[PDB]
Amino acid sequence: MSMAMSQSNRELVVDFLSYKLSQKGYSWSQFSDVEENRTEAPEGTESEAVKQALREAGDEFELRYRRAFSDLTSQLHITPGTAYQSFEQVVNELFRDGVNWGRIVAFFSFGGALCVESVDKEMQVLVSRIAAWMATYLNDHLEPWIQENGGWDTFVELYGNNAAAESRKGQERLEHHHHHH
């Protein structure tokens, strides 16, 4: 009953960079998949709740990254030749042994950041570079671990809309909730 389980992967990464650059004030298709001849897709249903948790989880992870240490690309240099290596070091960092939730969302907004500063540094070709590294790592290492136990339905069950704040408030039961009456 397949249909877009592997193609949807490249759809989540491409949609994350489309809204990322759109935030500042730059286009994405301008230097990404510019080659015409597309597939159009049926409509995209997994990105509904999935992309949703990726937008609130990407803005909360970024706010906590600078609010807890500093910027990401600000520390990187970015350039067509040693850029994939930079994202390669941050990738191994997160992977402590296998694939635990949380590092996947931080990796989504992380690559999107390198794409923003990339265009600002006259690195259009660099943007497309991170686009293939994001859809590849997602369809390579995160592929055999997501389909294993619903990696998108689960990623949304723990990082749903405002799930980060819901883990400290929605807790209630084992948290402490004083209303047993």
């Binding site: 992870f61 990254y65 520390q75 960092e93 635990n100 723990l158 799930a163």
Partner: peptide, 16 residues
């Protein structure tokens, strides 16, 4: 490289 080592730290404060 400093990134990555801290990207996981925030994970705790925001883990599920």
């Amino acid at each position: 490289g400093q990134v990555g080592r801290q990207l996981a730290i925030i994970g705790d404060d925001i883990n599920r």
